[PDB]
Coordinates of C-alpha atoms in Angstrom, one line a residue:
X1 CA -1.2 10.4 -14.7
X2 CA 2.3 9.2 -15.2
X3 CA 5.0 7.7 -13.6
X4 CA 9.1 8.0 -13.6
X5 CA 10.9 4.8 -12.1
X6 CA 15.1 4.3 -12.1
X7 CA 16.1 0.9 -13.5
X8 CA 19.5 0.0 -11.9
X9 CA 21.7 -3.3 -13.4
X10 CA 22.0 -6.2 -11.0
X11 CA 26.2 -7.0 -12.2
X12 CA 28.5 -5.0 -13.9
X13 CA 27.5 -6.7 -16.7
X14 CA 24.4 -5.6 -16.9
X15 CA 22.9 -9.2 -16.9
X16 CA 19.6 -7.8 -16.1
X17 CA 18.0 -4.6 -14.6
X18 CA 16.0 -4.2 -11.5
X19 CA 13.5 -1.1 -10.7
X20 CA 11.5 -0.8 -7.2
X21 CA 8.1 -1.7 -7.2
X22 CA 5.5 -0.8 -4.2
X23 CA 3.1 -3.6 -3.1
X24 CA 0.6 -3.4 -0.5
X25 CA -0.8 -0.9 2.3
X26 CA 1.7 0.0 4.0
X27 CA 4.1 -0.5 0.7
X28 CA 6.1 -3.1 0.2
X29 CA 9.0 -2.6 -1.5
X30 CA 10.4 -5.2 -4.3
X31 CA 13.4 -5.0 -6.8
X32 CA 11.7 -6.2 -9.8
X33 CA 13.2 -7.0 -13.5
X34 CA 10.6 -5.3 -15.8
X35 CA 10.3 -8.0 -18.6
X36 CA 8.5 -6.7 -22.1
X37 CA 9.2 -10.4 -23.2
X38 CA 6.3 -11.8 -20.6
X39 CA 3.2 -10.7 -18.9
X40 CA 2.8 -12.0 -15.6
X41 CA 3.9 -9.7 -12.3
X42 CA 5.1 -11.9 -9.9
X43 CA 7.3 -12.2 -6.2
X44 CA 8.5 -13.9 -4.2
X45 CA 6.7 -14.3 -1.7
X46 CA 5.9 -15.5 2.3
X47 CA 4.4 -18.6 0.3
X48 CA 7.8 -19.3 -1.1
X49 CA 9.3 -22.9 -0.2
X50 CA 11.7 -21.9 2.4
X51 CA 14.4 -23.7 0.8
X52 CA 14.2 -22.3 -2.7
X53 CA 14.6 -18.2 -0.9
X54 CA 18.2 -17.4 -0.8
X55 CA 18.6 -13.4 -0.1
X56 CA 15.4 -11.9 -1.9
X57 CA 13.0 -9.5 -0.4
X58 CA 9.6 -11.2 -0.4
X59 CA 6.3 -9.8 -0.3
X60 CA 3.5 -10.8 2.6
X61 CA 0.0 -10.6 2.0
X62 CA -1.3 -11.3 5.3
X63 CA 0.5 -8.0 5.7
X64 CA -1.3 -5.4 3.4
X65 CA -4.6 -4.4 4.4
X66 CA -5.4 -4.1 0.7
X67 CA -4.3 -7.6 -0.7
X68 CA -7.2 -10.1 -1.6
X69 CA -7.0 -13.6 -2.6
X70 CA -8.1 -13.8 -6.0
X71 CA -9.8 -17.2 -5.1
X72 CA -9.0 -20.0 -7.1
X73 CA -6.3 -18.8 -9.5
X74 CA -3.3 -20.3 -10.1
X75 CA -0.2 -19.4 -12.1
X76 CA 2.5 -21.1 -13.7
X77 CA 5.3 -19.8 -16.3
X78 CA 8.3 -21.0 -18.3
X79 CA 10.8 -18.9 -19.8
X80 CA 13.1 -19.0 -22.7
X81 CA 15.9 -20.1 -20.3
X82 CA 14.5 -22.7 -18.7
X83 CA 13.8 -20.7 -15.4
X84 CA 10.3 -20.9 -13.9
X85 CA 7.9 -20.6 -10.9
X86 CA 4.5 -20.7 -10.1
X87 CA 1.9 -20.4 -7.8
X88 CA -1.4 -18.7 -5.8
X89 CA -2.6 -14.8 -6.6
X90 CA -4.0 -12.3 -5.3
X91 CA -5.1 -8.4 -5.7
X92 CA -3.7 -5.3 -4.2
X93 CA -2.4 -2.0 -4.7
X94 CA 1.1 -1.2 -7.0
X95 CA 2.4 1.3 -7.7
X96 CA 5.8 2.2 -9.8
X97 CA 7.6 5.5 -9.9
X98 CA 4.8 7.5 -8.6
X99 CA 1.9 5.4 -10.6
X100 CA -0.5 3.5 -8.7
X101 CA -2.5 0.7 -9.6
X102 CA -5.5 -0.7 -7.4
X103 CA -6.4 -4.3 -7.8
X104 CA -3.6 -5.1 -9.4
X105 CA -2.8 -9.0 -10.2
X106 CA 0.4 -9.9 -7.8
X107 CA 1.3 -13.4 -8.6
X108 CA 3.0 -14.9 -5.2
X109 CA 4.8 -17.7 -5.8
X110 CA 4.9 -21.0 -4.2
X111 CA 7.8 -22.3 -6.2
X112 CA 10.8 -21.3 -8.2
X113 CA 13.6 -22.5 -10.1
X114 CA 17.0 -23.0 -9.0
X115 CA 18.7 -19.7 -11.7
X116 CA 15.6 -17.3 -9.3
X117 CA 16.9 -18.7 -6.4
X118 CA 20.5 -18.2 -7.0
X119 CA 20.0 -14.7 -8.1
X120 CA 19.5 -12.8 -4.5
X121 CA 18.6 -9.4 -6.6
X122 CA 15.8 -10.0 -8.5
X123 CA 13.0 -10.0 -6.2
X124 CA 9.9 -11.1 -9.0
X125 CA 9.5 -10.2 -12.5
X126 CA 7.1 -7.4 -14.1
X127 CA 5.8 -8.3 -17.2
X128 CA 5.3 -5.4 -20.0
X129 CA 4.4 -7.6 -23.0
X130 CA 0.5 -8.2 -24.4
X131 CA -1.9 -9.4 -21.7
X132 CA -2.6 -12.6 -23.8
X133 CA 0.5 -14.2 -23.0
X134 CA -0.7 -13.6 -18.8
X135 CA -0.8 -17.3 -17.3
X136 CA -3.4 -16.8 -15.0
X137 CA -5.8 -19.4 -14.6
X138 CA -8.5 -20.2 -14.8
X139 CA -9.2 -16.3 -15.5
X140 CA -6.6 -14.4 -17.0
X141 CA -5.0 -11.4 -15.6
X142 CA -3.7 -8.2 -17.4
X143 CA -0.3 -6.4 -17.1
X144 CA -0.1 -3.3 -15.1
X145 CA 0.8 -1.1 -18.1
X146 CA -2.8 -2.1 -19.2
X147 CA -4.7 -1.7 -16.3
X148 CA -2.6 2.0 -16.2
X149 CA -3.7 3.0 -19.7
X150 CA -6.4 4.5 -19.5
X151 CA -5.3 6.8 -16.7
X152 CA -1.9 7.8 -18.7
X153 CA -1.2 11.1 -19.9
X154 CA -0.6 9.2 -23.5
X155 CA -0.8 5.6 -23.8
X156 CA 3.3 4.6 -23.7
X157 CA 5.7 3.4 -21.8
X158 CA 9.7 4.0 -22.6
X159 CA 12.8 1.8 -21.6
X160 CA 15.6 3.8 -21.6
X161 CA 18.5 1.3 -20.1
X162 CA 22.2 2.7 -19.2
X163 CA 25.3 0.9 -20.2
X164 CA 27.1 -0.1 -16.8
X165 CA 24.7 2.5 -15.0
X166 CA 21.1 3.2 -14.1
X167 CA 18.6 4.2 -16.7
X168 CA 14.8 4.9 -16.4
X169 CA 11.2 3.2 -17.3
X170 CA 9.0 6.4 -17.7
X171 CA 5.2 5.5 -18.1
X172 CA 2.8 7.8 -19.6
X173 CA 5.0 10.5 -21.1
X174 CA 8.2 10.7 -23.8
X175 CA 10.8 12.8 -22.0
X176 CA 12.3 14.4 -24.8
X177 CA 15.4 15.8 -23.2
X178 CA 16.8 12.2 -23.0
X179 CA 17.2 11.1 -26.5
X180 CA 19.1 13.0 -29.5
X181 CA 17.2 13.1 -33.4
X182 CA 14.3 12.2 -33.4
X183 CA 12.0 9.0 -32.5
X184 CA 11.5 6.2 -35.7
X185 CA 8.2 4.2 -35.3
X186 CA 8.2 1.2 -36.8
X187 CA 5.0 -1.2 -37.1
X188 CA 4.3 -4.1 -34.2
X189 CA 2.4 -7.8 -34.5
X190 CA 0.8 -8.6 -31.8
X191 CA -0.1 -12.1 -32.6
X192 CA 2.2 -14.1 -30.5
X193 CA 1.6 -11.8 -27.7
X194 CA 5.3 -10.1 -28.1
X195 CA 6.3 -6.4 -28.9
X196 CA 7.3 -7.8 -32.6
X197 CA 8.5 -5.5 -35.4
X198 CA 10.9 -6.0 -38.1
X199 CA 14.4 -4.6 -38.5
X200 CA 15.7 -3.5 -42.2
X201 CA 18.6 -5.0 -41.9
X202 CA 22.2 -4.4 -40.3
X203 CA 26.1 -3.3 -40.5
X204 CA 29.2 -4.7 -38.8
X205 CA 31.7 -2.0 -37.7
X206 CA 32.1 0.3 -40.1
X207 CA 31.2 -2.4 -43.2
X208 CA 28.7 -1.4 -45.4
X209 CA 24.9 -1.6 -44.5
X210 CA 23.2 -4.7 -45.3
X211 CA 19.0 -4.2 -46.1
X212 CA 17.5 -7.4 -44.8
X213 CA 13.6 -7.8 -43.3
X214 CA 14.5 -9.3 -39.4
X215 CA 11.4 -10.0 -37.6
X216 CA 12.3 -10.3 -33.8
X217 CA 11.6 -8.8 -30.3
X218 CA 11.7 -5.8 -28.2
X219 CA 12.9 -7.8 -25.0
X220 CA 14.1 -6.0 -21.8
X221 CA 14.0 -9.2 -19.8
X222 CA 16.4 -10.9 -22.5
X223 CA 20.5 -10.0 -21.7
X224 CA 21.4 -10.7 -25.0
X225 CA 21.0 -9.7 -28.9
X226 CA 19.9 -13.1 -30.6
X227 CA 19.8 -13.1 -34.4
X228 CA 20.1 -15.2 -37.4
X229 CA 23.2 -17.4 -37.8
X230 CA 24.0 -15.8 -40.7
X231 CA 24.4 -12.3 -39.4
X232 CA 26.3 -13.7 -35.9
X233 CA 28.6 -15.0 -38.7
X234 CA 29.3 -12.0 -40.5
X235 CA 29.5 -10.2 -37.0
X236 CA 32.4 -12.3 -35.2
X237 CA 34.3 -13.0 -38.1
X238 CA 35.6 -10.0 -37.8
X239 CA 36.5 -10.2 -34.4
X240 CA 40.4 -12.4 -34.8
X241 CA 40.0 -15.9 -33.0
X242 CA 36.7 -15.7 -32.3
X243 CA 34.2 -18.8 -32.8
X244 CA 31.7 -20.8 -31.7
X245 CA 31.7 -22.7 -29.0
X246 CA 29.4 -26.0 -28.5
X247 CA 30.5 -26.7 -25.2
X248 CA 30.5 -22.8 -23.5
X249 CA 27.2 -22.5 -25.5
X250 CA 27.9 -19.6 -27.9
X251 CA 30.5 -17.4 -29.6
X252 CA 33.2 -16.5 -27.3
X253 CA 36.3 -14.3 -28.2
X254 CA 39.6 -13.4 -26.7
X255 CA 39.5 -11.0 -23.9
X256 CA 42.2 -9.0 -25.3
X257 CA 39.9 -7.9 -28.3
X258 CA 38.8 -4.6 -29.2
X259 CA 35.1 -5.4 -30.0
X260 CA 33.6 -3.9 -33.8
X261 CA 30.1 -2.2 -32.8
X262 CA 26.7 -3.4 -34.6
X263 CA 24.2 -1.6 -36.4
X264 CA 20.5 -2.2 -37.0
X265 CA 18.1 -0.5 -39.0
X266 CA 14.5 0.3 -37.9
X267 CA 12.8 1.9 -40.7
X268 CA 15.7 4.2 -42.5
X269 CA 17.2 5.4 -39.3
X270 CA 19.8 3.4 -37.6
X271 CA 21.0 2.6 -33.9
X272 CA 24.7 1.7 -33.3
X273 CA 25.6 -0.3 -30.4
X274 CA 29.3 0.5 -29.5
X275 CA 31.2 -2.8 -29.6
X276 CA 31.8 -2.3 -25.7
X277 CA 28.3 -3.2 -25.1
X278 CA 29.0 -6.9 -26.9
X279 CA 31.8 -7.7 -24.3
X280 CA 29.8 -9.9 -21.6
X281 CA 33.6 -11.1 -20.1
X282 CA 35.1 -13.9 -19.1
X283 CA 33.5 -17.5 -19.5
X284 CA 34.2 -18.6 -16.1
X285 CA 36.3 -17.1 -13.4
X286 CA 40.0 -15.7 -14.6
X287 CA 40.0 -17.3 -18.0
X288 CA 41.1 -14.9 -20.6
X289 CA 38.4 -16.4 -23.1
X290 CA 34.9 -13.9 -23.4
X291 CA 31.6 -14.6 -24.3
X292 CA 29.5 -12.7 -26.7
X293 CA 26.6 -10.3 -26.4
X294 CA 25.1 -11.2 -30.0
X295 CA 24.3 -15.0 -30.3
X296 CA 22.3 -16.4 -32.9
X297 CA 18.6 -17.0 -32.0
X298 CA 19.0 -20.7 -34.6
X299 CA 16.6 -22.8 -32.1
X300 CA 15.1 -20.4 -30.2
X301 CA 12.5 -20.1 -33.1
X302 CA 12.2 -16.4 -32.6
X303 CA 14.8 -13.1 -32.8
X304 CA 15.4 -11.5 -30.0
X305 CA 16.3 -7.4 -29.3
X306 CA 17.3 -7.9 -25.8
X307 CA 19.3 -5.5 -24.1
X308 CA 22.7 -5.4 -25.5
X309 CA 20.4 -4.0 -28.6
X310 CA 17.7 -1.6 -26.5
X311 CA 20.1 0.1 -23.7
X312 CA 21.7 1.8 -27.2
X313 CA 18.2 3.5 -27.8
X314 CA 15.5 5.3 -26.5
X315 CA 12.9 2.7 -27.3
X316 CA 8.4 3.6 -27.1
X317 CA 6.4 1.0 -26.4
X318 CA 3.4 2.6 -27.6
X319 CA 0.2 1.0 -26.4
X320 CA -2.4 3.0 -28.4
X321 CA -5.2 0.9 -30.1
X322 CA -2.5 0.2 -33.4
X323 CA 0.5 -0.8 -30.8
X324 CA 3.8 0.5 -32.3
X325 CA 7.7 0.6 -31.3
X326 CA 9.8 3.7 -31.4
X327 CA 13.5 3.8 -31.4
X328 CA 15.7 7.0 -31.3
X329 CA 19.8 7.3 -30.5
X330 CA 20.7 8.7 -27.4

């Protein structure tokens, strides 16, 4: 089997991406960020506090003739923002861009934070990273990328996000009309759980390129790039009155800059994102002062290829018994 699902941004930023899901008999449909930083599949839900729904589309068990309390389990998650939620789960049919899953674990919360609440497009998450990291309990659940495995054509996913427009999440197939060259695999740990793999280093504009081992993350719930301080350095000193700002939280830069693009190496080949794709505009409503799509990941204790670095590349998540990543231009 396989399945082909459009991934549309929320903003014109592009803070985040959202791709319809199917839940339930008859379907319900959600607007789901796909996250290959996490690995639970949760909604909102018609067990959502009341108060903390603001605009979402929720999903209703008592609904779907094929939703089944998983009895007893509970959920809870945290994320690298501070966000969270948590609550009850149960079974039931999904199914994304033609790809159906029975039993699947749909995670319906009872609470969420204030940043889910305030963002009236994102309907749940989908989580796309290693089924260790699933915080199911007291019997942990896996993602639906591994409960679709087995029934794939080839066991892959691809994230193939658009720069202020949609892109796609194929599952089970490498379309290989929409990438140019060819596809670099690079090796993955999976011992925290992550889609981790190591970058060979980096180039500013068009500076010389810089080998350097950068062990980070293939994120597509993560807005930003976050990498070393050293190499956020090099990156916006070359960008004139840029700098660092403790009390915005990270490098801003004046709005009237042209924006240098940044290059990072996975194996020998190497993916450019155009400098557009740094600009994340102004800081707050009609100031002329920008903030910065490549932050440095000092105390966040990991690097992070979020999607300032993946919607430049056609990126394989390839699930086969040795996980690896592939990257190609586009």
């Amino acid at each position: 089997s396989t399945g082909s699902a459009t991934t549309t941004p929320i903003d014109s930023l592009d803070d985040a991406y959202i791709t319809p899901v199917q839940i339930g008999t008859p379907a319900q449909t959600l607007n789901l960020d796909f996250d290959t930083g996490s690995s639970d599949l949760w909604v909102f839900s018609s067990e959502t506090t009341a108060s903390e729904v603001d605009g979402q589309t929720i999903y209703t068990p008592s609904k779907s003739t094929t939703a089944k309390l998983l009895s007893g389990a509970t959920w809870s998650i945290s994320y690298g923002d501070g966000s969270s939620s948590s609550g009850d789960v149960y079974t039931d049919t999904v199914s994304v861009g033609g790809l159906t899953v029975t039993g699947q674990a749909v995670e319906s919360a009872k609470k969420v934070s204030s940043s889910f609440t305030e963002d009236s497009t994102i309907d749940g998450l989908l989580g796309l990273a290693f089924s260790t990291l699933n915080t199911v309990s007291p019997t942990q659940q896996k993602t639906f990328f591994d409960n679709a495995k087995a029934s794939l054509d080839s066991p892959v996913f691809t994230a193939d996000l658009g720069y202020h427009a949609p892109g796609t999440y194929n599952f089970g197939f490498i379309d290989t009309t929409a990438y140019t060259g060819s596809i670099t695999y690079t090796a993955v740990s999976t011992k925290q759980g992550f889609w981790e793999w190591t970058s060979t280093g980096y180039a500013v504009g068009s500076g010389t390129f810089k080998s350097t081992s950068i062990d980070g993350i293939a994120d597509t719930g993560t807005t930003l790039l976050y990498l070393p301080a050293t190499v956020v350095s090099a990156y916006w000193a070359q960008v004139s009155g840029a700098k660092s700002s403790s009390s915005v939280g990270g490098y801003v830069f004046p709005c009237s800059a042209t924006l240098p693009s940044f290059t990072f190496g996975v194996g020998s080949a190497r993916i450019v994102i155009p400098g557009d794709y740094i600009d994340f505009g102004p800081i707050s409503t009609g100031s002329s002062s920008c903030f910065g799509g490549i932050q440095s990941s000092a105390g966040i204790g990991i690097n992070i290829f979020g999607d300032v670095a993946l919607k430049a590349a056609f990126v394989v998540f390839n699930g086969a018994t040795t996980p690896t990543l592939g990257f190609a231009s586009k």
